[PDB]
Write a protein that binds this ligand. Sequence first.
Ligand SMILES: [Zn+2]
Ligand SMILES: [Zn+2]
Ligand SMILES: [Zn+2]
Ligand SMILES: [Zn+2]
Lengths: 109, 109, 148, 98, 97, 94, 94, 80, 79, 64, 63
Amino acid sequence: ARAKAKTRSSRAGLQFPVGRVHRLLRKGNYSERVGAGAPVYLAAVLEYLTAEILELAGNAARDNKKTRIIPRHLQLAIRNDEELNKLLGRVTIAQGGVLPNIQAVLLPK
Amino acid sequence: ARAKAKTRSSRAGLQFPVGRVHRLLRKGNYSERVGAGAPVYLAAVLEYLTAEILELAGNAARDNKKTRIIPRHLQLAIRNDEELNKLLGRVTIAQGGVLPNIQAVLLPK
Amino acid sequence: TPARRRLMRDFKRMKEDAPPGVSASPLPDNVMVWNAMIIGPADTPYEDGTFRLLLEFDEEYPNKPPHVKFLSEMFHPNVYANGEICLDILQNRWTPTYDVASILTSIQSLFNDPNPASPANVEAATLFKDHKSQYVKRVKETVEKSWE
Amino acid sequence: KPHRYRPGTVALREIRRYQKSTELLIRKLPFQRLVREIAQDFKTDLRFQSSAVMALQEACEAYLVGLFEDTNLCAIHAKRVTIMPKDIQLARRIRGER
Amino acid sequence: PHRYRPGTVALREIRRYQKSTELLIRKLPFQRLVREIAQDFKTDLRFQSSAVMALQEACEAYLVGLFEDTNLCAIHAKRVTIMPKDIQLARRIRGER
Amino acid sequence: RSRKESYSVYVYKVLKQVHPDTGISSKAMGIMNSFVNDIFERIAGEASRLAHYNKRSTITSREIQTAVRLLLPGELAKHAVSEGTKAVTKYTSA
Amino acid sequence: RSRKESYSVYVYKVLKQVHPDTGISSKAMGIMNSFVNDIFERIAGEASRLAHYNKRSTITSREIQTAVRLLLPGELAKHAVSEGTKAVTCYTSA
Amino acid sequence: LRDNIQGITKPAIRRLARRGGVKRISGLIYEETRGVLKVFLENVIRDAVTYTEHAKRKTVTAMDVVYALKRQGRTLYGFG
Amino acid sequence: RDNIQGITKPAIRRLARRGGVKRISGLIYEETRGVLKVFLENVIRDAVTYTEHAKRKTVTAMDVVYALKRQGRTLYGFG
Amino acid sequence: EELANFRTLVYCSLCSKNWKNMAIKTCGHVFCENCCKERLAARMRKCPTCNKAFSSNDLLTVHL
Amino acid sequence: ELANFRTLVYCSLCSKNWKNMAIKTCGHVFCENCCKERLAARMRKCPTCNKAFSSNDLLTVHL
DNA sequence: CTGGAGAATCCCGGTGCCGAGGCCGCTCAATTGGTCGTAGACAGCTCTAGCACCGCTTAAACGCACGTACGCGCTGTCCCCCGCGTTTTAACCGCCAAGGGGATTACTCCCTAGTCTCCAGGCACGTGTCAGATATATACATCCTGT
DNA sequence: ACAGGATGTATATATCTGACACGTGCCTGGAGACTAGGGAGTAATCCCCTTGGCGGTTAAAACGCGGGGGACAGCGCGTACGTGCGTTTAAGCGGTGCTAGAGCTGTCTACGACCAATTGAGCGGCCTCGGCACCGGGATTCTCCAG
Ligand SMILES: [Zn+2]
Ligand SMILES: [Zn+2]
Ligand SMILES: [Zn+2]
Ligand SMILES: [Zn+2]
């Protein structure tokens, strides 16, 4: 009978977990101690990046007249966005394929 | 009045310090606990690698009729050895220069 | 294979021209395993002892240093009790040119001339260097046990 | 009268066809046999998870497709449309693999 | 008078500069470039001389490696003269463009 | 009967918050989980290196902000820093 | 008046053990110290990752075995493993 | 198992090149593609087996392959 | 401004000579001094973020070394 | 016996399968290029005979 | 084969002094007497490959 | 350059199915509340080093004229790659079966963290001498034009 | 191909010099001894999933052939880049001066680790229906050869 438990994620207005991020920071052997705002900052950054990629992948899936996001749409969203492409330039996505582009020299004329 | 202190490096027949390596392992936030043989093994590996590079650099210095090793000889020794060149392939050595190689097409004929 | 070729050569060598006080021979079904015994060399407390050894070889002979084990108990500054010997030529100084006969000659020579700079048995080194009488008594008892 | 496309038309159409799909291009069973043969050189009687073999294959087509994209650029730089074994060598040497 | 054919002085320069380890860019004009590249991040920054020297060593090593790669590209294109197409091909293959 | 944790619930909440009438496959959810784990590891490893460089023993929000600046490029970092600062301010105010 | 640590004494001992009549410049010693620190960090970081992957909390000599095998190429790793094993055997025997 | 590199067939290599946007292909490119693939696989599997035998198990898991690829700077998503 | 012109034609030529280049076209001097400034903006931007995190006003050599290591271009001889 | 001696003199003492055709510039010994190269590949830069350190550039081929 | 070995062991020019001196420029091996005689007689060109040689290019060979 | 023929692609409709989406224990992980020691913020002081300026030397950058070597375009040949049809092979799928080995749980014991004391190896600071840089006069190797 | 002249270029000698190798005082970090607790090595058990095999379909691979498109060699031409020489130009070195700010020390307080109790949120299991992949069929477009 202390008080109703309010999540640190709901205190900061986030969807990603703050307690899980704090636990993963504490057991990952990153530092001797972990500050209070570090998990809040990291969860917000992760949620923002997830929202960005999901928005772009949803746009890509909608451009293909589909209602589910498959790895092809994630690959298209990442490789079409200049910022995400450089963020994830060394990443292979399973069942992702490539961007359709043919060199202008190979085209007939 | 307990016993005369013997270094763990002399007990293991090494020149590199075992105690300093153990301290650096313990203060590096690599793991919660550090085994007894880990510093002994790591110091031996470091000593072997330094011995290899120093031997090759001494060979390179004696090929240039000099008795003191400069960074040029270190660069030549590292880039002339096939194994060490791949071990240190992304390493820039200050004041090391390059190796003399001219493409056969550019040579006059 | 040239490895087993060399092993047959060493078979002929150790079967026909075995060095004094030593012997070695592979198994007829496996030239990769050799059981050996050495008669103690002269001018030693180890003299005329029957020190049996088991030698096991691989295809990396003689490119990589193989292992030789004693079939007899060991007590020596450069020899571990478990039959392992602190010798670079099979540990750190491996050479393809070294053969079984040459190895056995080196082994029998180190009986007369130990190299305590490479200590494997600290107790044996201490007895040999500071307590020569106790070391002699222990070696005599050990050689007697080798006979028995 | 037989009908034949000019050399290049079906190549362009299959470039479009294979740049739009996401399937695996190497046959799975021979790729698995190759993986096991290569693994025989490090440890005997190893066992492989199907997901591990699939991960290896997903890595291999991605690597080869990237290498061919670099090879096509080298070939175009040499002012031709046919990729040759020297283009692969140039691409692999510039990236730092050879 | 004496006149060397074009391609001999260049080869001697290649041999000369592949044998030394000196810095090939002048110190002061490089410091001035660093200090203006750094003034759009923070105003009135200060630099250690060792920091500027490390920057110069890194830049010269990077440019020398890029020139080796762009020479390989030119030789692949059956030329001996490098040109910006070669630099662009090298940069694109190494994943910098 | 081990229990394994993932980010599927939160990724699915963000998906329904962004595109309310769009779904996601199981193989795409695994890719998003891999992405979240990879970014978590990158930022945490960079913050640990910053703290070690500055002879600190605590990873605060300042170290994570600096790590985000070092990792994320261009405008992607500028928006992420704003989102992190807003979340920290709201958390401290609540 | 702070005291800073380096590997100069040990590198100089190894140098006089290998080439007894060869010296070394001051700038070459800095490069050797940087090399030693870089290799130490690589091996320690790989061993930490191995221990975390196997859900262990101790870095033993087996983790450094594996880290050396992963990092050093070809015969350079074969000789390094032998040197490490001999040192551990000698340390445990003495 | 022996001579399994020829299972990487000419049409498979052609399809891989077509996905890479290659219009026309020389006949000598196939054997070099086999060579490059063999080198890449020998590099990845050597680390995967090292991870497997450090854990003291006889089965190579997908996580071993993922770690071996992540160690080479070619992180792969979708397998854990 | 105008300090990119301090990277002169002879300096670029001798960098190419150390790289092994036989001859250089005239359109390369403006290409390499743009490549060099892109590289410098990439390195200095990380070095200054290290300095700001340290709450310093001077960019140290170890900050440059960390900025380079962060890009996979580790440098020996400065710490 | 003298034929066996000349076998030893002409053939590489290590391999005993090829003629001596590769000499060490530092210690004056001669072996076969194959054995010298595999010893270099073993990262063993010491003479088989005199154990003096040497390098690849200290190796020179010889004819007859 | 015995005659062949006598030719291999003894210097090609002299057939009486054992081959003990190597030439860095061409890799042939001869004897010190014959090579110094060549040098003193301005016969600084190789017996076999006619390559130039001088006192600096002598390398002693030991079995 | 402008039209038909044919092949491929695209668009629409009907059908099944299995995978995404929702829902219910329940168990463990997140939350709440005190307590305490120490990590880090803050203020003050020191003195190292970074910045600014001035003058002289001169090495290097810059500008111009010439000529030739190389980039580039055009042409022709032929061979090697491609498109296609037919036959051969083995990949793929479905099912069955046996067992090796991954994945847990208990238990114990031995290995390692933590603490206190001691002392010697390594660091900071002087100091002299020898390896190496520099200047100069060579003999020797190399390029280039005329032969 | 060959020879001589002119220009870099390697070599030996002599001289300075400052950086390295060594020696000394001291301190603090490594070593030795002990204690306590939990991390992991070992044994046992369970059952998931890896491997092996067999048979049928058929899709992909292999082989052959005809031809034409591009790779490559050769040749001519003209721009533009290397080379050398004379004229700025500003880099480099030295010397001096000023002061911002890096680095250290000493206090002290907020803050994160630790621990115990509590509860609710997400995980595993379990259904269920609609997005979608596929098959059938018609409409549109792209390529190619004849006109
Ligand atoms: Zn041989
Ligand atoms: Zn020798
Ligand atoms: Zn002679
Ligand atoms: Zn000759």
